[model samples]
Target chain A: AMLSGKARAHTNIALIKYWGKANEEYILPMNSSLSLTLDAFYTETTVTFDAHYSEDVFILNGILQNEKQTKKVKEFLNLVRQQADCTWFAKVESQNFVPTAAGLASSASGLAALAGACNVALGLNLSAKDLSRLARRGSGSACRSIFGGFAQWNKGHSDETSFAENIPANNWENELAMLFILINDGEKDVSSRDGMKRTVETSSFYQGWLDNVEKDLSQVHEAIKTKDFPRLGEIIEANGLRMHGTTLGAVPPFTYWSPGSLQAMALVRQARAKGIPCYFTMDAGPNVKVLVEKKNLEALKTFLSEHFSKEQLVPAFAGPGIELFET
Target chain B: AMLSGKARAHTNIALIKYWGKANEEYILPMNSSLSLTLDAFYTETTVTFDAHYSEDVFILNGILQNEKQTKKVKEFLNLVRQQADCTWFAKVESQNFVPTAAGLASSASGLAALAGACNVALGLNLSAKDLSRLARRGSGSACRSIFGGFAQWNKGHSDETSFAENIPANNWENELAMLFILINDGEKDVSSRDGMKRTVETSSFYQGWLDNVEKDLSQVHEAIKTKDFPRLGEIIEANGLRMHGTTLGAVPPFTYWSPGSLQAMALVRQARAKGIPCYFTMDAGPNVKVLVEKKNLEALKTFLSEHFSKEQLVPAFAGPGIELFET
Candidate 1:
C-alpha cells in the first residue's frame, strides 16, 4: 500500500527567465530565474511500488499504456529509485487539471506532484530541498514548482545547488492575482528541451540575456516581495519578450505566437488604454496569461469576455505546494 | 545600310570576383575582378543598320526575332540602339561557334561581338574603352570582351570609369592556353544578378572578401605580367573558393558545382599531382575551364577525354579582339 495517498503540486510562472545550460546532463541553467506559484491549476499524481510486478508500469488517466509510456515513466522513476536504493518496480498515475493540449505549465505541476508522491511512497522522509532536487531530475522547471508563492530557482554551480528556494508565502498579503486567457490550446511543435537547446546553440543574443538575468532576478524578487505590481509586470513582460526573442534566433527559427496570441496582446493594450493594470505573459504556446490585481479581476475578465468567449478565461490566486495527507 | 558589319566578342570569366553593387543603376562592383579571353569559344555577330526596317530586330542562328532571344540580348540591343542614336531600326544576325547553352561564357562572346558589330554599323568610331562601357551596360562580364589576352574590369568609381583593360596579346608568346570542359547546358535556377545580390545582403563573410580583393587583384595581375603559372593558379583557385563561399552564405544558398564540376576539379588536382601546369577556374555555371601551357594541351586533352565526352572538351589559344572585315 505504498502509493495509497494522493499528491498535489502547483505551477510557477517565470518572471526573470531561465535560458541556456552550463551542464546539459543535470539541466543546470546559466542564470537564475524567479517565479510565482499559482493556486488554481495543477496536476495530482500517485505512484505505487509493487513487488509483484516484473516491470515498471504507468497508468495514465486510468488507461493501460504501451512500452513508450513505460519507458518515460521508468526513466523518471529510476532517478527517484536510485537515490532511495529501492529495487521494486513502480506504477505512476497522473492527471492534469488544466487544459491538456494547451500551452500551460503542465510539466511543472505534474513533476512537482510526482516528487512529493514518490517521497511518501518510498518513505524517504526527504526535506523540501531533496524533493526539489528529485523533481528537477524529471523536468527543469519542476524545481520551481516545489515551492509556493514567490520562489527563485537559483541556477547554481552544479546540480546540487540549482534547486528552488521558497520566499515567505504570507509576503503577498496584498491583492495581486493572475488570469489565464486561453486563446488556443494548440500543441507545440518544439518541446521545452528542444527549444532550450536551440536557444543555447544558435541565438547570438543569448549570452547578453544570460549576463543580465541577475539584475532582473533581484529587482523582480524585490518587486514581488514589496507587492509592487507595476515593477513586477514590467520585469515579467521584458523577460517574456527576451525569451521569445531567443526562440526566434534559433536556427531555422520558430515562434510560438499565433494570430490569436497577437489578438490577445492587442486586447491587453486596449485594456491598458482603459486604465486597467493588466499585463500578459506567455510560455511556449499561444495562450496569454494576464497578471493583475485581485481588485481588478472582475472588470478585466469582463473586458476580455467582450473579445473572447467566457470559457477561455480562468482566474487564479496564490497557492501552496506539496501537501501531505494521512491515510 | 547603317549596320552591315560583322561583330566578334569574347565572354569574360571573373577571376578576382564581383558580388555587390554600391549603386544598382550603374552596376558598379564593390570590388574588381580579372579574367582571361579565350580563342576557340566566341560569338560573332553581324549587324546591318538598315533604314528600311520599322523596328530593331535581332536574328540568332539566322532566325528573325525581336527582344525574346534572351533577356540579356534584348537588354543589350536597347543599350546599343540608345548609344548609336539610330532613328531607324537595325538588324542583328549572330552565331555562336561554341556551345552557347552549355553554361559556357556566351554573354562574354555575344555582347563583345554585338558591341564590335554595332560600333561599325552605326559608324560610331567608338574606342574599345567606349565599347567596353556599352557592353558592360548589357551584362557585367561583357566589359572584358573589348580586349584580347588577359583583362581586368576595375570596378570603377562611376559608369564612365568602369571598363576592361587588356594585357598585350604577345604576353603569352611562349606557352599558355585555355581548355573548356562543359558539364551541362541547363538553365540556372538563379540569375547572376539575383545571386550576387543575395550574397551581398546575407553573407557574413562578404566584408572580408571586399577588403582582400585589392591585394589579390594586384598579386594575380603581377603574376600574369611575369607569366608565373604557379602563382596565378594558386591565386585563382583561392579566389574561386572565396567567391563560391559567399554564394553558399546567401539567404537561400546555392552552388554552381554539380557532381561533374567536382569531378573536373578532381581531374585538375590529379593533373597538378603529376607535375602538369593545369589550373582550374569556374564561372557562374558548372563548366570547368582549365589554363595550362600549350605543350601540355595534347596530354591534358587526352586525360579529359577519358573522363568526359569528346564534344564536352574544347581547345583554345590566345585570341585577338574583333578585326575589321574587308568587303
Candidate 2:
C-alpha cells in the first residue's frame, strides 16, 4: 500500500427531497433540495494508490467486493485520479457504520468518505465546495453529506456549478433530532437512482413536483433560519409525501411503502394528534425517519420504543463534515 | 299513506376518480368521472308520503336515526318534495346490503335508491337522466349509481347539466370483474366530502390533478371502446393513485391508507409480478378494490386468497341500474 488516506462522512436525510434528475450523466437535480446530516449512521473509507496494483480493488465492511459491487466506486475513483493527474490503480477499503440493509442511505456517507479519502491520498487539496461536486458524481445525495447540520444542494446547470453548502441554523444542533425507525432490513426493490429515472421519464406528476419544490425549499430555508421546528416538520413531511406521490403517477405505478412503513407513519400521526410534536419522512425505501426537537426526544423515544424495538430506534443529532487523515 | 315506492341501487367504483367539487351548493364535480357499477354492495330504500305525518321519519338498517344522523337525508327529501310540489311529510326506510363500515361507499347506492324511490312515490315519472341529476344533490358520487355497468358523470357547469349516464361498453359485463379487500371496518377519520373540500382548497397539487384528469378520462374511454384490458387497468390504477396523492399535499395532510390497506396493495403488486393481470384502486378509505378480467378471476382469487381470508375478499360483477317498485 502506498499514499493511503482515510475519511469519515455521515449520512443525510433530505427535508425537501431530490427526485427526478435534470441531467442523468452529470447527476444534476431537477430541483434544489435541503437535508439534515445525521450522526447515527456513517461510512469510513480508506483509499490507497499503488503503482504495482494490477487493477482497482474494493473491500466493503471487511468483505472483498467483485467488479459488479465496485463499478460505482471505481468510476468515482477514476474522476478523482483524472483530476489529480495520477495513473496508479487504487484499492478502496470502505466500512459502513450502519445496520445492514437498514435503508439508511449508506451511499451518501460512503461516497462522501471516498471522495474525502481520495482528495487526501492524491494530495489534491480540493476545496469543500469542489469536493462536494466530485462526491455528487458518485451519488447525487453525496454532495449534501459533505456538510454538517443543515445543507442545501443547489440544482445548478453544470458540473462546475452544482454543489452543496451549509445552511445557517443558529440552534439546529441543540434543537433538532432525528429518529430512525428501521421498518425493513432487506434489500430495496428499486434503487433511488432507478426510481428517479423512471419517475422523470414516466410519471405524470413529476412536473408538479418540479414546479412546486422551489416553494417548499424556500419555506424550509425560512423555517430553518427562524428555528421554527413545527413549520420545518410540516414542510418536511409534506415534501417527502409529495415526492412519494409522484411514484404513484408513474407508468405501472409503484410505492416504496411496506405495511410496516404505513404502521410507523400512523403511529407518528397518532403521537402528533396527542400533542407530541413530531413528523416523519421517507426516502426511496420502506424505512421511516422522524424529525423532532431534542427537548422532546425522550417522550418521542418512549412512544416509539413501545411500537419498535430499542435497537431499531436510533436517535441522531446534527453531524459534522468530512474528517480526513493519513492511514 | 298517500303513496309508497321501493327501489334498489348498487354501488359504483370510480375508474377516473372525482375528488373535488366546483360547486359545493349544486354538488357539481370539478372534473368528469367514470365508474363501474358492481353487484356486491347496494342499498334498498322505501319512501312513503303521508298527509297526516307530523314530520319526516328516517329509519336506516331497522334503526331509528336521530336528527343529526338524518340531517342530510331530510335536506335531500326536501329538495325532492319541493320539485314534486308535494306538501306531505315523508318516511324513509333504507337497508344497506354491505359489510358494516367496509368502506364500500354505501352512500352512493343509499342516496341513489332514495332518489329513485322518491321519484316513484311522488309519481313524478322522472327520466333516468333527471334522476341522476337529482341524486347529485344528495351525494356527489350518488349520481353515477343511478346507472348500471360503466357510467360517466359529466362535469357540467349547471345543476341541470351535471348528471351521470351509462357509458357504452362492448362486452363489459362478460369481460370485467372487481374484487374488494375489506381492510378496515371502522369509520374513516375524514369523510369523502370533507376530504374533497380540504384537498381542493389546500393542496398545491390540485391544479395538476384537474389539468391531467381529462387526458386520463379520454384515454380510459378509448381503452374501454377498444376492449383493451391492460390499458384500461393501467389508467385506472394511475388515476386512482393520482387522486389519492393530492390528499398528501393538503394542509395538515392525511392519507386514507391503513396498514392493512398497504398490505393488500403490496399483495396485488406481487400477484401482477407473477403474471396475474390485476390492478388495485382505493377511494377515500382503507379498503382496496382490485380490477381484473373474468378470465383471470380464478387466478387472482386464488393468489389473494392465500394472503387474505376468504371472508375479507368479495368478488363482484356488473350489476343493474336502479330497480323501482311499489310496496
Candidate 3:
C-alpha cells in the first residue's frame, strides 16, 4: 500500500528581511522577519511513500534531478523521516509555477509545498506551527509560507520554539499589491546562503543590521495593524536597502543590483514623484518588486510598461494558506 | 597701500572619503582620507586687505555675493584676521573655472585658493604644511588640495596636528587618470554637512565605516608605492562604496545616487568585464569618477561616449599644488 498526498504553497516576499543566521544547522534566523505571501508565484508537490520503493526520488518540472540538485531535498526528507519514524522511501515531484524570467528564488514555495505534502502523506497531523518548523529545516524563509497574507517568523531560542505565525492584516490584502519587475533571471554569482555567511563573518556593518531590525520590525507591526500603506511601503523599502547595505561592507563586497534593477527602481521613484504612491524592494536578486495599492496597480503598471516589456511585469495579490489533497 | 595676492588651486576628488567629523568646529575628521588633486576644475581668487575698505566685499565670477553666500568666507577671513592681527577688511575676487554643467563641488579649490591668497597677501610666509593647516580651517578636503597629486589627511587629535601631506606615488600620477561622469548637476536635497551629522548621530553603520578606513588607507598606500593601478582602482571603488553604504543605515536614510549615477556605474562594470582595467568612486554627490591608467583612458572614453554625451564626460590629470601670485 502507498500513502500519497499533494500540496501547494505560495512564495512570500519579506517586508522585514531575514539576512543572517543565528543557528546554521537548524536554519534559525538572527532576527524576526515578516513577509507577504503572494498568489502569483507558487509551487505544487506530490509525495508518495511506498514500501516497495527502494529509495527516494525527486522530479522537478517533469525532469529528474541529479544528486547535486536533490541533495538538499534528500537531507530535508531525512529530517522528516526521522521525525515521523517512517522507513518507507518517498517519490517527490514538485512543479514550480514561479515566473522563471523574474530571477526570483522558488525555494520558499518549493520547500514549503514539499513539507506540506510530507505532513499529509505521513499522517503527521501537525498543526500549522509544527509544519512551519518542518519547512524551516528546509529553508529559513520557507517557514513563513505556512501562512498566507502577512506572516512573521519569530526568531525563537530553540528548534521547537522558532516558527512562523500569521499577522493580522485587517483584510488589507485586498488593497495591497506587489508588481515584480524582472531584471536578470540568471543565476546569481553569490548565492544568498554564502552571501549571508560572508556578511556575518566579515562585514563590520552587520552588527548594525542586527541592532536595527527590532525597531524596523516594531514599525512594520504598527503599520500592518493600522493598515498604513505608506508606512508599510517606506519601512519595506528601507529595510531591504539596509539588508543589501551590509553586503557592501563584507570582505570582497558584492551587490545583487544589476543595471536593469536600478532602472526599475528609478521608475518607481519617478512614479512616486509624479504622485503615485509606490515603493520598491529587492531580495537577494536583481529583480525589483514595487508595492502599491490595487487602485494604483494599473497606473504603476502603465508607467512601467513604457520602459519594460509586458513579459517583464508581473502583478501578485495576497495568497491563501497551504492546501493539501489526496493524490 | 593695499596688501594683495592671487592664487589658483585645483579641485580634488576623495579616493578615500572624509564622511564624518570628530570635531565639528575644527572640522577634524573621524578618520584619515586620501584624494587626487585634478587639473580639470580649479578656482582662482585674489585677496586685498586695505585700510580704505569699510567692510569685507566679495565678488564671485563678476557678481557681488550676498551675506548668505559670503557668510562662510567671512567667518574664515575672521580667523585669518585674528591670527595675523590685521584689522583691515579684504576685497575677495574669485572665479570658478569648473564645468558648470558637471555639478562638481568647487569648495575644495575655492577654500584652498582663498587660504593661499591670505597667506601671501598678509605676508604670513607660511610653509606648505602651515598653508595646509590653514586650508583645513576653511574645509577639511581643502587641505588636500594644498598638495598636488595624491595626498592623505591625517585625522590628528588637535587643530594644529590635523593636516594633509603628499603621498609618495612613485610618479604613478603620470600613468593614472580620472574621468568624471556628471550625473546630477542640481543641488542636493541633503547637504553633506547635515548628512554627516545625521549619520554620526543616528546611523548604526557609521562605526563600521570608521573601523575599516585604516585598512583601506594602508592598502591604498601600498598600491601607490607599488604603482599597481589595478590594486589602487579596486580599493578606491570599494572604499567609496562603503562610505556611501553607511548612509543607508541612517534614520530617515538617504542616498546620493540618482538613476544616471547607477547607469554610469553599470557602464564602468561592463567596461571592466570587457577587459578594461578601471574602477569608480563618488563623493557626497551623484556624479561618478572612474580611475584608469592613462594608457587605457582613450578606450574607456570611447566606450563611455556611446552612452553619454561629450559634455557630460570630463577627463582630468594629476594637477599641481596651490600657485600663488602678486595681484
Candidate 4:
C-alpha cells in the first residue's frame, strides 16, 4: 500500500501582525506575531509517496497545476524528502475553502496543512514545532496555524528557532471570535510578499514600525492574559492601523483598504458605541475582521446584515490546528 | 463709518492637529496645535455693532440665516457687546470663498475674520492674541488664523491665556504653499465639534493620541527651522495619520477622508517618489491639502491638471493675518 496522509488546517487571523521579512528566502519575520486559528476558512491537503511515481506532481482543487504553480510545492516536498530519507517521489492534492491572496489568511492554513500531510506521509515523525518551521518556508504567517486557538510565532534570529508556540485558548474560546468583512475576494493586485518588501525597502516609516511592534506584542499579551476584552480590542485595532501605515509611507504608496473597508470599520465603531463591544482589524487586503464577543454575535450579525449580505459577514470560531487522518 | 467693520481672513491648515475638546462651551482644545496660514481659501465678514439693531442678524452669502443657524453669531455678538460695554446688537454679513465646514479649514478664516470685524466694529482694540481668544470661542482652530506664516495655539488652562502666537513664516514663506483637493463642497453631515466629542469620550486610543502630539509639534518645528523639506513631509504625513487614528478608535468612529482623499494622498506620495517634495493633510472634510515647494508650482500644477481640474488644486501662498477691508 502506498504511504498516504491527509491533513486539514484552519485559517488564522493575526491580532498582532507579522509584516516585513528579515530573511526573504527562509521567510523570517521582523517581529513576533500573535494570531487566532479560525474555524470558518480552511484547507485540506493529501500527500502520497508512491514508488511508481518518477517525479513530484501537484493538483490543486481537482486541476493539475502548471509548472510555475507546482514549483512551490516541489520545493517544499524536497525539504521533506531530504528529512525522510526517501528516494520515492510524491503526489500532492490541495483544496482551498477560503479566498486566496485576498487577506483572509488562506496561505496560513494551506501551507500548514501541506506541511502536516508531507510529514505524515513520509513517517518523518516531526514535532508540531518542526511542522510550523517547515510551513514558514511557504508563507511567514503559515507558521502560526500549526496549533489551535491562539498561536504566537517568535521571530528568532535563525531558521532553527523561528517556529510558533501555541498559546492556549484558555477561556477565550467562549468570549472571542471573528467576523469577516469581505470587501473584495479576488486575488490582490499586490501580493503580500512584494508589498511588504516595497514598504521595508522604501518607506521612511519602516523603522518606526520595527520600533512599534514590540510594545504592541507585550501589551496585547497582557490583555489576553487577563481577558481584558476592551484592551485587547483597542490594541488589535491600533496595531492594524500601524502596520497599514507603513505601506502608505512607502515611496510609491498603496492601500488595501477600499471605501468598503472603512465603512465596515465605522460600523464596528458604531457597534461598540451601541454596547456591542466589537473592534475591526485588517490585513494586506481590503477585507476587515471584527473581533467580537460570542455572546454579541447575533446582535453584530443582525446589525451588519442591514449593510452587508449574509455572504459577506462570515463568522469564524475556534478551530483545530493541523490534523492528520487516514482515508 | 457707523462703527461698522469689514475684514477678510485666510484659512490655516494645522500641521500638528488639534482634536478633542477640553472645555466644550469655551472651545478649549485638549492639546496645543501648530498650523500654516495660507492666502487662497478665505472668508470676508462685516460686523456692525449698531445701536438701532434690536437684536443680532446674520446673513451668510446673502441668505438670511435661520434662528438655529444665527445662534452662534448672536452668542459671539454678545461677547463683543459685553466687551464694548454697550447696549447694542450687531448685523453680521459673511461671504465664504471656500467650502464651508468641508474640512478645508474654512472656519479658521471664517471665525478669525468675524472676531476681527467685531473687534473693529465695537472699537475693542484688542491685541491679536486677545482676538485669537475671541475666535477660539467659535472654533478652536480659528485661534490659529490670527497670524500669518506659522501659528501655534497654546492650550492654556483658562479662556484668557488660551491664544495663538505667530511662528514667523520667515523661511517657509516661499518654499511652502498649499493646494486644496476638494472632493465634496457641501456642509458636513457631522460637524467637527460633535465628531471630536464622540472620539474623546469613547476611543480607547485617546490616551495614545494624547501621548503623541508633543513630539510631532517639536519635530515639525525643528524641521521647519532647518528648512528640511523631507523631514517636514514625513512628520507631517505621520502626524495627520496619528490624528486620524484617534477617530477610528472612537466609539462609532468617523472619518473626514473619503476614497478621493486617499487617492489624492496616494498621488502626493507618488509625486514624492517622482522626485517632487510634497506632503498631504486633511481637515474635517474630504478635501486634501498638499504642501509643496513654490519652485515646482507650474510642474505640479501641470501634472495634476492631467488628473484633476484647475479648480480642484487651488493654490494658496503666504497670506496676511485678519485685515480690515474697506466697504
> Between 2 and 4, whose DockQ is larger?
2
Q: Model 1, A71-112: lDDT tens per residue?
A: 655778888888878888887788878765356877788878
Q: In candidate 2 chain A, what residue range of length 10 has the lowest lDDT sum?
A: A98-107
Quick one: ranking by TM-score, best first? 2, 3, 4, 1
Clashing pairs in 3: none
Worst lDDT 10-window in candidate 4 chain B: B245-254
Q: Which stretches of candidate 1 lie over 4 Å from their true place?
A: A1-5, B1-327
User: In angstroms, how far off is B128's CA in candidate 3?
Assistant: 1.3
Q: Write the per-residue lDDT of candidate 1 for residues B11-117, one digit (tens) a residue.
A: 65666776677666666778887777777777878877677988767777777655555556666666767776666666778887765644577767887788777
Cα shift from native, residue A61, model 3 (Å): 4.3
Q: Which has the higher lDDT value, candidate number 1 or candidate number 4? A: 4
How well is each residue in A173-257 modelled by candidate 2, as lDDT tens digits? Answer: 5578998888887878888888889999987778778877998999998887787888888888988998888887777668888
Candidate 1 vs candidate 3: the TM-score winner is: 3
Full candidate order by lDDT, most accurate first: 3, 2, 4, 1
DockQ measured for candidate 3: 0.52
> What CAPRI class is candidate 3?
medium
The count of residue-pair clashes in candidate 4 stands at 3
Q: Put down candidate 3 lDDT per residue, A207-322, tens digits, no spaces.
A: 99998899999998888788888998898898988998898888877777777877888788899999999999898888999989999999999999999999889999999888
- Tell me the DockQ of each model, to 2 decimals: 0.02, 0.65, 0.52, 0.12
Could you give me the TM-score of model 1 versus the true structure?
Answer: 0.52
